[PDB]
A paper describes a structure:
The rest are acted on by the third and last enzyme in the PTM pathway, apolipoprotein N-acyltransferase, Lnt18. Lnt is a member of the nitrilase family of enzymes with two domains, a membrane domain (MD) and a periplasmic nitrilase-like domain (ND) harbouring the enzyme’s active site. The active site, defined by the catalytic triad, resides in the ND slightly above the membrane surface with an opening for substrates and products that leads into the bulk membrane.
The LntPae structure and that of an inactive Cys387Ala mutant of LntEco were solved by molecular replacement using the native LntEco structure as the search model. Some however reside in the H4–H5 cleft and occupy positions between Arm 1 and Arm 3 and above Arm 2 that feed into the active site pocket. In the LntEco-Cys387Ala mutant structure, where lipid density is well defined and plentiful in this region of the protein, the lipids arrange themselves in single file along the hydrophobic pocket entrance into the active site. In the C387A mutant structure, a row of single monoolein lipid molecules appears corralled in this proposed portal formed by Arm 1, Arm 3 and the H3/H4 cleft that connects the active site pocket with the bulk membrane. It makes sense therefore that this conduit can be navigated by phospholipid substrate molecules, especially in a sideways orientation with the sn-1 chain on point. In one of these (LntEco-C387A), the γS of Cys387 is 4.5 Å from the hydroxyl on the glycerol backbone of a structured monoolein. This is compatible with a mechanism where a fatty acyl donor substrate, such as PE, accesses the site with its ester linked acyl chain at the sn-1 position of the glycerol backbone proximal to the nucleophilic thiolate for reaction. The apolar nature of many of the residues in the periplasmic extensions of H3 and H4 and the three arms is consistent with this finding.
Numbering used by the authors: 3 to 508
Write the structure that this text describes.
């Protein structure tokens, strides 16, 4: 270092700290101003840099953000990776590094085309470039758009913007507001402060708009069974039997009382084709008392090619949902977690027969669009675990007659970490975006009911064997976001980009 903050070594360190500051914005800590402070740090530290230096600054900021926020992936790698301790740490640092590239990319491109510090760079160029940059991290090599700052404000002042343009609009606006604040602090000029406050305060009245209308007549008692069943060391018929006894014995008392019962992802730990007698018998018991069950299961279905394809599945039983193996009322998982449910670069099969022994097992993908689940005259658009954080995918599957949004997930991995909470926060956003109640049941994890505005209706603690029963009411409204999607944001992002690129090219 030489003089003040003008020298690079200090800025990389400061970028590391402000990146880490962004973690506090998300679900466990729930401090939304940490987003603006984090973004101001990223915006201000990239001022007056060479594109390469800014890209380095950006990379560090991402490393502080992703290293502190995503480090919970270690507990899954350590358990099932079969790897030494130091390698697992190496893999986690590698993941945070890979994610920080896009942050470094954002800063590198921002500095080259918009080097001078001007409101154009912070308020126009950055939010559009950030919109593109955050997209790449989310679209490249099967996703992982985790820790988007829009979710940090589910309870905050800007929540009214979400039902209109979606969560990615809050990402766009937060980058915008932070830029004006960072510009105001660096230039010692109050004019961007006024604009930033105005830009920040104007969306506040939008939280009082209700784009949905409720429906007392369709009010139902719903039950979500959270079995605390641990992850399996050894699979025998005894553990399977122990698992079904846990769920059925909790399900049987509520069959008469509650209209809909939900079981978490892969609740039945056996293939669907084996359990046909248990399933058909369970359907009868439910239909007689006038209730319906929604459960996750593993389905290996014979392909036309006569080989076997395995799907992560949701199936429907009970009244209004007669169970059939060929029944079209079911959900198969589309987007598969990269190293958990599938092996990337599966072409490595050639060395496999000699030398080592590698996993050949991989799941299969369902259709990108699947019809909503129908049970008890209720339409549920469903998503399994990770899928709920994909906002565009959820909205495309959402059909206006949909009564509830449904997520079943197994958070048993990551337990006691901040991951399940981060996961839970993003799920709330889908409810506010679409103005529908969300029913989320986990094996162990956050099992709760969320209202149309993102309000938490009812919740049960983690790591317990419990049933969450309460009354939930449907809503028939249509938000602007449900109709348009994020098309308006991209048009705005094009307009901002088109203008900012045209100004940079002179
Ligand atoms: C491998 C991932 C690279 C790890 C990124 C950390 C870079 C860093 O923070 O080094 C700055 C240092 O504090 C100097 O000021
Ligand atoms: C330079 C400006 C730095 C500002 C930092 C804001 C930090 C706010 C810290 C608020 C902490 C909230 C919290 O501690 O929640 C923790 C969790 O619930 C239990 O571990
Ligand atoms: C500055 C924050 C930089 C933090 C980046 C260091 C990564 C932390 C890490 O990988 O540790 C795994 C964690 O301990 C498993 O729970
Ligand atoms: C302000 C600088 C301090 C901000 C650092 C926050 C890091 C944090 O939130 O710690 C969570 C931890 O990574 C959970 O594994
Ligand atoms: C390179 C990454 C290789 C390690 C990834 C393997 C892994 O973590 O597996 C998780 C497990 O399958 C979760 O169910
Ligand atoms: C380029 C390389 C970038 C970093 C890749 C390194 C490690 C990623 C492996 C960690 C992710 C695998 C964990 C598996 C998992 O999380 O499974 C959970 C469950 O199956 C679904 O919800
Ligand atoms: C122009 C846009 C480029 C964006 C590059 C994309 C990601 C870079 C993120 C990784 C950080 C790159 C570090 C570069 C570096 O270390 O620079 C060496 C030094 O500046 C030489 O004199
Ligand atoms: C230049 C890249 C432009 C890519 C736009 C494609 C797109 O909008 O993808 C939708 C995405 O899933 C929504 O976040
Ligand atoms: C140049 C275009 C960049 C390629 C991304 C466009 C794209 O893949 O579209 C997103 C798709 O709709 C969602 O997966
Ligand atoms: C939070 C950061 C807000 C920074 C505002 C700094 C500012 O307004 O500068 C004073 C103004 O120039 C009066 O002379
Ligand atoms: C999604 C939400 C999209 C909202 C976009 C709405 C208005 C854009 C106005 C942006 C222009 C505001 C910058 C003006 C400014 O910063 O001026 C500072 C001062 O005058 C310098 O000396
Ligand atoms: C909506 C409210 C906008 C108020 C803007 C404002 O208060 O700016 C004053 C500034 O902080 C004084 O230097
Ligand atoms: C290569 C793309 C990076 C994929 C990393 C896998 C990952 O992020 O796992 C998260 C976990 O699966 C959440 O359920
Ligand atoms: C600064 C932030 C400014 C936010 C703009 C505020 C309101 C615009 C929304 C006006 C309503 C647009 C019509 C959409 C609509 O009415 O959706 C219902 C329809 O049934 C679906 O097909
Ligand atoms: C520069 C990229 C401009 C391409 C914009 C068109 C585009 O990629 O849109 C894809 C479409 O949304 C797919 O569903
Ligand atoms: C290298 C210079 C860096 C420039 C940095 C800023 C450039 C932003 C410009 C255009 C963004 C693409 C605009 C694409 C508009 C169409 C996207 C779209 O329509 O896709 C949405 C649809 O809903 C999908 O499902």
């Amino acid at each position: 270092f030489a003089s003040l903050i003008e020298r690079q070594r200090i800025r990389l360190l400061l970028a590391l700290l402000f990146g880490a500051c962004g973690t506090l914005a998300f679900s466990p800590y729930d401090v939304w101003p940490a987003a603006i402070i984090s973004l101001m740090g990223l915006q201000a530290l990239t001022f007056n840099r060479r594109p390469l230096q800014s890209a380095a600054i950006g990379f560090c900021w991402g490393f502080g953000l992703f290293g502190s926020g995503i480090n919970w992936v270690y507990v899954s790698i350590a358990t099932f990776g079969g790897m030494p301790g130091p390698v697992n740490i190496f893999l986690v640092v590698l993941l945070a590094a890979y994610l920080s590239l896009y942050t470094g990319l954002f800063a590198g491109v921002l500095s080259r085309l918009w080097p001078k510090t001007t409101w154009l760079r912070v308020a126009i160029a950055a939010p559009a470039l950030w919109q593109v940059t955050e997209f790449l991290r989310g679209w490249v090599l099967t996703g992982f758009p985790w820790l988007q700052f829009g979710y940090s404000q589910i309870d905050g002042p800007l929540k009214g913007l979400a039902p209109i343009m979606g969560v990615e609009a809050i990402n766009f606006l937060l980058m915008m507001v932070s830029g004006l604040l960072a510009l105001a602090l660096v230039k010692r000029n109050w004019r961007p402060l006024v604009v930033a406050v105005v830009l920040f305060a104007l969306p506040f009245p939008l939280r009082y708009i209700q784009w949905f209308t409720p429906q007392p007549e369709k009010t139902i008692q719903v039950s979500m069974v959270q079995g605390d069943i641990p992850q399996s060391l050894k699979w025998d018929e005894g553990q399977l039997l122990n698992t079904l006894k846990i769920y059925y014995n909790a399900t049987a008392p509520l069959m008469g009382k509650s209209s809909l019962i939900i079981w978490p992802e892969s609740a039945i730990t056996d293939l669907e084709i084996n359990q046909q007698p248990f399933l058909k018998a369970l359907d009868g018991e439910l239909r007689d008392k006038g209730s319906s069950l929604v459960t996750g299961i593993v389905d290996a279905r014979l392909n036309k090619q006569n080989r076997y394809d395995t799907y992560n599945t949701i199936i429907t039983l009970g009244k209004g949902a007669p169970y059939s193996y060929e029944s079209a009322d079911r959900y198969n998982k589309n987007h598969l977690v990269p190293f958990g449910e599938f092996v990337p670069l599966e072409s490595i099969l050639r060395p496999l027969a000699p030398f080592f022994d590698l996993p050949m097992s991989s799941f299969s993908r369902g259709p990108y669009i699947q019809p909503p689940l129908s049970a008890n005259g209720i339409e549920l658009t469903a998503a399994i675990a990770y899928e709920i954080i994909l906002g565009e995918q959820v909205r495309d599957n959402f059909r206006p007659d949909t009564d509830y949004l449904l997520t079943i997930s197994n958070d048993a991995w990551f337990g006691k970490s901040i991951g399940p909470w981060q996961h839970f926060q993003m799920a709330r956003m889908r409810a506010l975006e679409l103005a529908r109640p969300l029913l989320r049941s986990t094996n162990n994890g956050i099992t709760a009911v969320i209202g149309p505005q993102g309000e938490i209706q009812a919740m049960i603690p983690q790591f317990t064997r419990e049933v969450l029963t309460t009354n939930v009411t449907p809503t028939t409204g249509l938000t602007p976001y449900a109709r348009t999607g994020n098309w308006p944001l991209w048009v705005l992002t094009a307009l901002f980009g088109f203008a900012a690129v045209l100004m940079s090219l002179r």
